[PDB]
Amino acid sequence: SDAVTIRTRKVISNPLLARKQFVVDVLHPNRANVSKDELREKLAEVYKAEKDAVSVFGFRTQFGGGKSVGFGLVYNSVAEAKKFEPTYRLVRYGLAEKVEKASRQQRKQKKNRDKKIFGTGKRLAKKVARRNAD
């Protein structure tokens, strides 16, 4: 393969969020696919963007290969890129960390078990220790 080409269309400036929104389309006549991080770096060197401050999220390849169309947006000043952005995408680009939590059933069971305790249960714990002691 010789090259892909990335064209940005319908560019909208959104100063309400300090960002620019656009529809990327890439012509990759040979390779297979997009290699999305290469597009992030390419859009970084297109405007001036420091590629950890960009995010392209929507992508789908046209029928019969070659053309892939998606939606992508650039934030200036990567602090706002961490600010006005959903957490799943920031984890997806490695600029955040996924928290681990128990699954929905365990959380619901724990909430509906400590709905049966009034107060801290320190009196209940002390009382049950004393009352099964003798």
């Binding site: 046209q62 019969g64 290969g65």
Partner: protein, 185 residues
């Protein structure tokens, strides 16, 4: 509690199922154009039935009715854009006089046979299914593509599909592989 996606059916079974003239004409069409079953003839008959019903209740409306003007102009412009009527037959009595062959002539397999490139309509269809035709730039593998009158000059082979070059297929690849492996050394 979410809306329905609407749906319908494009084919229509005939009223008298078993008529030797009808079976003969259906099979004649199937041989002359290379169809898979009788559903294609049924589907074109349903499309034609809708068009003729629209034409009938448009003509029962008076001349120079604005609804007649707008809907008839849209219908005639559409059916000349797809290229079933001719260029100089832009009147409703002609679109009453349409035949099923005038619609099957404008398909994809009929055009990719008539324009050369296939030498047989059955070979034309199987060459469509194997993803070998670009209309404009787009690979298509529906035989019933119903190509427009304008895009007739852009049917060719794809960037893939070794008739269009770009790295011949798997069988020839294995063939040259054993020529290099056994006959080569």
């Amino acid at each position: 509690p979410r809306a329905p996606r609407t749906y319908s059916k494009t084919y229509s079974t005939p009223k008298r199922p078993y008529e030797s003239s009808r079976l003969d004409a259906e099979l004649k069409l199937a041989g002359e154009f290379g169809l898979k079953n009788k559903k294609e003839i049924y589907r074109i008959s349903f499309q034609l039935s809708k068009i003729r019903r629209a034409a009938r209740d448009l003509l029962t409306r008076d001349e120079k009715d604005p609804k007649r003007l707008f809907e008839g102009n849209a219908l005639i412009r559409r059916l000349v854009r797809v290229g079933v009527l001719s260029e100089d037959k832009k009147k409703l009595d002609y679109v009453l006089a349409l035949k099923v062959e005038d619609f099957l002539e404008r398909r994809l397999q009929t055009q990719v046979y008539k324009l050369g490139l296939a030498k047989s309509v059955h070979h034309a269809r199987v060459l469509i299914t194997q993803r070998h035709i670009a209309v404009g730039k787009q690979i298509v593998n529906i035989p019933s593509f119903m190509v427009r009158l304008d895009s007739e000059k852009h049917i060719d082979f794809a960037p893939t599909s070794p008739f269009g070059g770009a790295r011949p297929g798997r069988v020839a690849r294995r063939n040259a592989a054993r020529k290099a492996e056994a006959s080569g050394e």
